[PDB]
Design a protein around this ligand. Sequence first.
Ligand SMILES: *[B]([O])([O])[C]([C][C]([C])[C])[N]C(=O)[C]([C]C1=[C][C]=[C][C]=[C]1)[N]C(=O)C1=[C]N=[C][C]=N1
Ligand SMILES: *[B]([O])([O])[C]([C][C]([C])[C])[N]C(=O)[C]([C]C1=[C][C]=[C][C]=[C]1)[N]C(=O)C1=[C]N=[C][C]=N1
Lengths: 426, 182, 49, 98, 49
Amino acid sequence: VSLIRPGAVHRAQGGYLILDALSLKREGTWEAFKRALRNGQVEPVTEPQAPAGLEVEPFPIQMQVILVGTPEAFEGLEEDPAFSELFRIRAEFSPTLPASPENCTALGGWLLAQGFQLTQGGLTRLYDEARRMAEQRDRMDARLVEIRALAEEAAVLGGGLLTAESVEQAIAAREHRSFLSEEEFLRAVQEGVIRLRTTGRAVGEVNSLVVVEAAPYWGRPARLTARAAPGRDHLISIDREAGLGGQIFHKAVLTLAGYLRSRYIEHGSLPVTISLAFEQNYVSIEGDSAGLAELVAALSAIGNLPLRQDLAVTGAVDQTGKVLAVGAINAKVEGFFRVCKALGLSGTQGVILPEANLANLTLRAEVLEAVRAGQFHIYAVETAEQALEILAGARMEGFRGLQEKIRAGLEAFARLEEGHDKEDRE
Amino acid sequence: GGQIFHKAVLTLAGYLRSRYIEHGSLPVTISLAFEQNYVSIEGDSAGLAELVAALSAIGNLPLRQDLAVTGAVDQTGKVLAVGAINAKVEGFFRVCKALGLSGTQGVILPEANLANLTLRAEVLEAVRAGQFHIYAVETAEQALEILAGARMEGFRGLQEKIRAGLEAFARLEEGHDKEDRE
Amino acid sequence: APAGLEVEPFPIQMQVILVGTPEAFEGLEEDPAFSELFRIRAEFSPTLP
Amino acid sequence: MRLSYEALEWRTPIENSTEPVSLPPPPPFFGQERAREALELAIRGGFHAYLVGPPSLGKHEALLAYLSTQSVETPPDLLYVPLSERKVAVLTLPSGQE
Amino acid sequence: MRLSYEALEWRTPIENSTEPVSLPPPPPFFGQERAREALELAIRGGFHA
Ligand SMILES: *[B]([O])([O])[C]([C][C]([C])[C])[N]C(=O)[C]([C]C1=[C][C]=[C][C]=[C]1)[N]C(=O)C1=[C]N=[C][C]=N1
Ligand SMILES: *[B]([O])([O])[C]([C][C]([C])[C])[N]C(=O)[C]([C]C1=[C][C]=[C][C]=[C]1)[N]C(=O)C1=[C]N=[C][C]=N1
């Protein structure tokens, strides 16, 4: 009798047992644990080498077991109908918390109880960095361990005290420790290895913004170019028909095709074929970013429109022409600003971003300082027409309009195609 | 041909289309091939070389064979940077020296790779002596201008020669379709 | 071991440092537990000025 | 539209930063009233609950802190007693009597 | 553009090569200040790097 060892069930009698769903399912003990919970009784696990074994009475279960883990661990168990009635109560942890002065004070109190010494400015900067980490302006990040780690780094860089300078140094060091890839990209851009036009205007090309998959927190401009040729309506995205474009990118080409069709109908179809391709190969597409960038580049190629190359363009677009939000807008904006600063700010560089992402704009101190100084210009747009108007610097409607230029370009391409078919049936 | 090479043919097709539109399409088919089989392609090297060869074939343009051409190209016509530019330049210089330098051999390389040019002592000595000529280009037009030794624009231009070649090919194609519907 | 010794767990007061090519690290960075253990990333530049 | 700095400015301003802050510890599951209410209901009712959230958020630490401040009637002493050299049963005794 | 030898010349010139060099040992992680700073932070803080 004295050899029965007490497990988690025995020690949690009359209280609460806390388990991890992913670890519970990893060991394969879910069935036996579920049966024990159903019966309310359980016996200690016995070795198969027992000749007769002890006649252990089942141990009554009077606890409240609580499973803690990521949801993905729970869609591995929620399909079981027996799991539903056992766990009638679902406690879901919000990925973000409301960015309010009460929440900032609560975070400061939590950090003080954690053992760190904070100042008002240090707490303010921690609150701001948590908001930026959540990617939303009015929602802080709920991952308290990440903020605790950043606070630890700030304490180390500041001798224990969490002043504003110390936390700023900690954030700068965290950015710089993974900055090697961006440093190499900036060196290549400066040396001319990767040529990006951040000054002047060019036709059929635009500085699309991408976020590297190897580290989905570093943005960098990608020189997308579009070329318009007469022919069939099919739109070519050369970087997709090589094994790189994803399923999400599949929707993008059809979306631009539908918008280009429905928006411009004075022939039965689009008399042009559009070839979309970035200059580089680090842009293996997974997602609907760029978007608006591809659309404005294709429209400029169709209408022979010199787009302002100093303004980067990002943001997904629909077949209606409305510009949709994209993730990691801060990373894209900061990357383009870094590239422009490497080549030197001319007081006109900027980023074309959707107005939907305006609630996600948590740009760093340097970018906001540049915007205040007038060296950088953040543009918010709703529809692709506004973005192309900003790029070309003129209105769509009216004479010398962008829409009439695109229509004239399409008409010229149709005339050349009909000349070709005229020579065909001669 | 590799996956990286797959987008290369589309890139040249797009550039050849968008750059030369006086018919509804390109009235020619271009057959790209190396004479040898040790060139199993993995990457976008050559590039500009393929483009200038195709353009010369279209326009009946005798390219200077003493100048090697390397470097990727985009559908805009800008010449892209490539890796191991030093190896390519040194190999071409070695081949030219084996057959004897005539004082005009050289390499057409993108200006983007100028920051990667770390040529050996012999190549730099030959360049200083004038026996070798390293050329740096930004767009395919410059490279083909160097190859053909004449300007794109103006009369007796390269662009007008390519346009005339495309026009002649279109005339022959429309003669074929004329005989077709007769 | 028939019964084995009742060894007390050894306290860990060390600072582990992992050295290797990145390709070895994309074999481990996906683990969420690896992130908070190794809060400091030391990346070696392939080139020097 | 050309955004201005004021519309883009998001960092909360600081009027004094040279002094330490002294704030009381926050309640567990602060800013997460949904989960706190779920735990309150599961504790009052005795139901089995489960915590769901993004990884590396502090769910375990916050849950432990919240459960520490809880107060329940002292559990009875549960222990195995052998009815024989082969038969052993479960015995329930008042707390502290084992 | 026809590059000249001066633009192509990249080897640093030598004005004297017949004498031995006597230089102090460089600091560890020389030319790699990113990694050196990462190690400094990980050592001061005791974090795992
Ligand atoms: B995007 O951010 O949606 C963009 C869309 C494309 C049309 C320009 N693509 C990318 O940025 C891709 C896909 C991606 C991966 C991970 C997160 C988000 C998006 N990535 C890259 O740019 C990339 C991929 N591999 C290496 C380097 N960079
Ligand atoms: B290239 O260097 O990009 C070139 C492109 C092609 C259009 C002329 N191809 C090659 O040089 C190929 C592919 C390659 C392999 C390894 C590194 C870089 C490029 N290689 C060869 O020429 C080759 C292949 N097998 C045997 C011998 N040579």
